[PDB]
Amino acid sequence: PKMKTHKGAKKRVKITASGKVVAMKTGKRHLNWQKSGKEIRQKGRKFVLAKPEAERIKLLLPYE
Amino acid sequence: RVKMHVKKGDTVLVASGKYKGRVGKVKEVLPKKYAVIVEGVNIVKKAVRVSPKYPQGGFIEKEAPLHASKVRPICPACGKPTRVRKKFLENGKKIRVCAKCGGALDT
Amino acid sequence: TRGEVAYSGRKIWPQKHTGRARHGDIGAPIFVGGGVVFGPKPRDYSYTLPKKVRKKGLAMAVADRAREGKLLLVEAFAGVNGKTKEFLAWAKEAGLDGSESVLLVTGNELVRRAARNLPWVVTLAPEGLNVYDIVRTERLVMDLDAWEVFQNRIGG
RNA sequence: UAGCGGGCGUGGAUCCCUGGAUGUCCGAAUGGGGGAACCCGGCCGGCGGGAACGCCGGUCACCGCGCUUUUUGCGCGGGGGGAACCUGGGGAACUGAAACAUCUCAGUACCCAGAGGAGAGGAAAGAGAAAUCGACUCCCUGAGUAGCGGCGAGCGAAAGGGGACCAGCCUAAACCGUCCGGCUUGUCCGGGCGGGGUCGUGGGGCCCUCGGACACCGAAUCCCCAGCCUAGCCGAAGCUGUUGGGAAGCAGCGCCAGAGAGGGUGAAAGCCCCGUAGGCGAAAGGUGGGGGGAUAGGUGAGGGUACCCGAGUACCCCGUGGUUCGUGGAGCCAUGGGGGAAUCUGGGCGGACCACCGCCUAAGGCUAAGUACUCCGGGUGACCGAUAGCGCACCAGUACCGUGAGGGAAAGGUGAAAAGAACCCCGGGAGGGGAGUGAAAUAGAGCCUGAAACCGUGGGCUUACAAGCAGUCACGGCCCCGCAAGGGGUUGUGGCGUGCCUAUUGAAGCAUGAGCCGGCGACUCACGGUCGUGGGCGAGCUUAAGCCGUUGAGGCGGAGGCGUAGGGAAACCGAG
RNA sequence: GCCGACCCGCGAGGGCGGCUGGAGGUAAGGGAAGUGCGAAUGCCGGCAUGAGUAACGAUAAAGAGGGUGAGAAUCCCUCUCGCCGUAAGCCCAAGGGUUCCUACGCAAUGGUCGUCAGCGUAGGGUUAGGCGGGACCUAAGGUGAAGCCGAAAGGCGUAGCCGAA
Incomplete structure (x- = not known):
């Protein structure tokens, strides 16, 4: 019957209007200090794919 | 209550299995188990030879219990289904175009 | 099942110093009337069928007979009265023997009654059609009431 | 359950259907005891020739209610039972996040008490943004959105709208008399009574102008009639031949049908029988506004007033719980405590609060419907069929087991009917041997079938010079089928030949289970997605509950969901 | 079901034949599932394995004669023989409930057998004004009117009351 649909994943991801599981980079907070704008702009976004397809089965009903 | 078969106590014809195609005597109706008998199954029963109610050689029988739905009604005609009638005094059952059933006692 | 046994949860055997096997409460499919497992239940076989295609079939069914x-859709009958003689004579009129089938169609209380007892006259009428019924049977006996029933049934 | 037996029925019996007697003692038990069915008596009558003994009948428990002069009482009620369905005081743990304390099963089992064929709720101190809706329960969908969280597992709204169903009236306080006690006899503190009135466009109380009224809404209240429940009743249509123990079968001719639903009958029957389709009936006890009546009752303007309009309540603060809400800005709301008003200039929300603005009437109640569940009943099945199906198909909640709590079983078959084997032979009988019987006697009394495991009789074939996963291959010798060739099978000679299953890199292994054989035996259910696909429509696809309908009968029903545009956290832009 | 030296499939299996058996069966085209064993020291059932082997229940012991009955060292009738006697004799309380007593009976139970019973079928038997307990007494204790308390159950509990060999 009616299942959960998990909103953790939803609250931190966004597929590309079809099924290409794509999202945001990983590894902030505990960096900074010793670096420059290099990794700054580069922390911007991310790709994500492959096993995130299993992750695509995770979310289910809503799409969004 | 609920034993309204199709028989009473007089005389009727036979279409059975043992001696299919005979006729029924006075017809002792006993009991409500559909067991009926006239002169029908006249086989042979044992019963010991003891001096009391039995002769020196006890080995004989006559009429014996039988199934109810083995017979069919009749009247001064041939033998047809009994259809009932209000005599507006009593209640019996005439016959297909003809008549008689319990009509031997002012019926 | 194995938990709804008229027994108890009594785990008679210990686990260790015993003899033969190892078992919990008597309620288990490994025994006698001890509840089975995954089998037959008073369940429900049912689903949905889109009107369109469904009613395609409806038309198509009679259409297959129309193939x-x-x-035949008679107006008034010779066996109007719910008696057998007249209706049979009229069956002779329409050209019907004594070894066929009567998914009739037609909507007349009188007709359905007489034609209800008559052996090969399974009789069907229109407020509740059926395509199984026509596949298995054969004779749209009809009044146009049942045909007009067809019309508003497959309208589109 | 057969019988002896001696008695009752058309002067109408068993019998079912109704009411009534009977209903001993125990049983909330109930005078009072009390280890369950025993015992003791005070009391009114009765019986014993009956005072002394005993029984017959009458009485004698406790709590809650109003009258009763506190009196005795009189009237009232009460407790205890119950499968699940409902409510409440408290209330676990298993498990689950593979750990574990918060989060979870869960307010599930459990204990007790309560309540009814329904419960529960219910007329807004309501939603929540529509300056819009318009009492309550169920469903569907909104939407698994919104929303919560060691942001971990997981927990999950309502508004919306489409359906099931639709029901609406009163109190308290003000206020007007009236009866009773006190008393700081007061134009008084209150209460027993009656009318008064019920509000959210604020109502009314009361006082004065309107004219204030037959009619009008008519009940949930009483009174009926049709109709329903527990005995019953008519009932379509066949006759012959035949195989046989039995026909209904196969044949000839004929018929029945609102009836071909099924069961029976020695077998397979529309036509023989209960009955079916259909049609029909109740004295007795109960059921019913559907039709109806009547009854309870309920329906109208304005001025002035200004009296009331629910008090430890509302409201504030600390300790609280529900709500999607875990300490969050936490609102509402239910309350351990401390604190504590007002009377329409009265007060509860709009998620802290302030403002505005709408919303709305608390702190005293009630209300049918629709909704749920299944012991008992009928209906009726792609449900089982004697290790199944309930543990129970039968003298099963019984034999046996524990002190008890409690555990709990094994178990159907002659025939069509007993016709159930009389008479005689071996025996002490038990059992057989001839009989009769019925078609059938491996249908013979535990009597349809009667495998295998396992235990036996004769006979056909082999084996006593032999080293063995006992089988297989070539040959032969023997016994019996085969006309021929062939074949059965017996197994002497030799070629060969390391058990089944588990677990292992690796076993015939001395790592393992198995006595044999028979059976019951383990990959499933609604939905949730996912890939594929056989089809439909294809920019369109599709209904949920539920409604007319069915006697295995369809159809309907646009609420809603999605596909069509994506993207930005957002604001918003926009095939950008 | 039994038997098979015949037919068909590469196979699980399919067909034909006779005997047993006595009232069912169910194609082709489909479909709904407690569906396929051989193990699980399987649940159960039936029956074997050791196997004529250990044992017949304290090492205090029988013999005869006669009798009964189909059947006797096993029962019984008498002659004979040993073992106890702080018990291995007698009672009561307890408990068991026809076991009793008699006619018959061995198919069971009896640790063989059994004509025997203590078993069996049926009948027949248990006498109180004094025994013994109740129409008298309390103790520990419990219930329990009252009372105190407990969210529920109920705890706590005066007078009373049941209570004994």
């Missing part, structure tokens, strides 16, 4: 030429 063998085995039908």
Whole structure:
């Protein structure tokens, strides 16, 4: 019957209007200090794919 | 209550299995188990030879219990289904175009 | 099942110093009337069928009979009265023997009654059609009431 | 359950259907005891020739209610039972996040008490943004959105709208008399009574102008009639031949049908029988506004007033719980405590609060419907069929087991009917041997079938010079089928030949289970997605509950969901 | 079901034949699932394995004669023989409930057998004004009117009351 649909994943991801599981980079907070704008702009976004397809089965009903 | 078969106590014809195609005597109706008998199954029963109610050689029988739905009604005609009638005094059952059933006692 | 046994949860055997096997409460499919497992239940076989295609079939069914030429829609009958003689004579009128089938169609209380007892006259009428019924049977006996029933049934 | 037996029925019996007697003692038990069915008596009558003994009948428990002069009482009620369905005081743990304390099963089992064929709720101190809706329960969908969280597992709204169903009236306080006690006899503190009135466009109380009224809404209240429940009743249509123990079968001719639903009958029957389709009936006890009546009752303007309009309540603060809400800005709301008003200039929300603005009437109640569940009843099945199906198909909640709590079983078959084997032979009988019987006697009394495991009789074939996963291959010798060739099978000679299953890199292994054989025996259910696909429509696809309908009968029903545009956290832009 | 030296499939299996058996069966085209064993020291059932082997229940012991009955060292009738006697004799309380007593009976139970019973079928038997307990007494204790308390159950509990060999 009616299942959960998990909103953790939803609250931190966004597929590309079809099924290409794509999202945001990983590894902030505990960096900074010793670096420059290099990794700054580069922390911007991310790709994500492959096993995130299993992750695509995770979310289910809503799409969004 | 609920034993309204199709028989009473007089005389009727036979279409059975043992001696299919005979006729029924006075017809002792006993009991409500559909067991009926006239002169029908006249086989042979044992019963010991003891001096009391039995002769020196006890080995004989006559009429014996039988199934109810083995017979069919009749009247001064041939033998047809009994259809009932209000005599507006009593209640019996005439016959297909003809008549008689319990009509031997002012019926 | 194995938990709804008229027994108890009594785990008679210990686990260790015993003899033969190892078992919990008597309620288990490994025994006698001890509840089975995954089997037959008073369940529900049911689902949905889109009107369109469904009613395609409806039309198509009678249409398949309309593909063998085995039908007729009489107006008034010779067996109007729910008696057998007249209706049979009228069956002789329409050209019907004594070894066929009567998914009739038609909507007349009188007709259905007489034609209800008559052996090969399974009789069908229109407020509740059926395509199984026509596949298995054969004779759209009809009044146009049942045909007009067809019309508003497959309208589109 | 057969019988002896001696008695009752058309002067109408068993019998079912109704009411009534009977209903001993125990049983909330109930005078009072009390280890369950025993015992003791005070009391009114009765019986014993009956005072002394005993029984017959009458009485004698406790709590809650109003009258009763506190009196005795009189009237009232009460407790205890119950499968699940409902409510409440408290209330676990298993498990689950593979750990574990918060989060979870869960307010599930459990204990007790309560309540009814329904419960529960219910007329807004309501939603929540529509300056819009318009009492309550169920469903569907909104939407698994919104929303919560060691942001971990997981927990999950309502508004919306489409359906099931639709029901609406009163109190308290003000206020007007009236009866009773006190008393700081007061134009008084209150209460027993009656009318008064019920509000959210604020109502009314009361006082004065309107004219204030037959009619009008008519009940949930009483009174009926049709109709329903527990005995019953008519009932379509066949006759012959035949195989046989039995026909209904196969044949000839004929018929029945609102009836071909099924069961029976020695077998397979529309036509023989209960009955079916259909049609029909109740004295007795109960059921019913559907039709109806009547009854309870309920329906109208304005001025002035200004009296009331629910008090430890509302409201504030600390300790609280529900709500999607875990300490969050936490609102509402239910309350351990401390604190504590007002009377329409009265007060509860709009998620802290302030403002505005709409919303709305608390702190005293009630209300049918629709909704749920299944012991008992009928209906009726792609349900089982004697290790199944309930543990129970039968003298099963019984034999046996524990002190008890409690555990709990094994178990159907002659025939069509007993016709159930009389008479005689071996025996002490038990059992057989001839009989009769019925078609059938491996249908013979535990009697349809009667495998295998396992235990036996004769006979056909082999084996006593032999080293063995006992089988297989070539040959032969023997016994019996085969006309021929062939074949059965017996197994002497030799070629060969390391058990089944588990677990292992690796076993015939001395790592393992198995006595044999028979059976019951383990990959499933609604939905949730996912890939594929056989089809439909294809920019369109599709209904949920539920409604007319069915006697295995369809159809309907646009609420809603999605596909069509994506993207930005957002604001918003926009095939950008 | 039994038997098979015949037919068909590469196979699980399919067909034909006779005997047993006595009232069912169910194609082709489909479909709904407690569906396929051989193990699980399987649940159960039936029956074997050791196997004529250990044992017949304290090492205090029988013999005869006669009798009964189909059947006797096993029962019984008498002659004979040993073992106890702080018990291995007698009672009561307890408990068991026809076991009793008699006619018959061995198919069971009896640790063989059994004509025997303590078993069996049926009948027949248990006498109180004094025994013994109740129409008298309390103790520990419990219930329990009252009372105190407990969210529920109920705890706590005066007078009373049941209570004994």
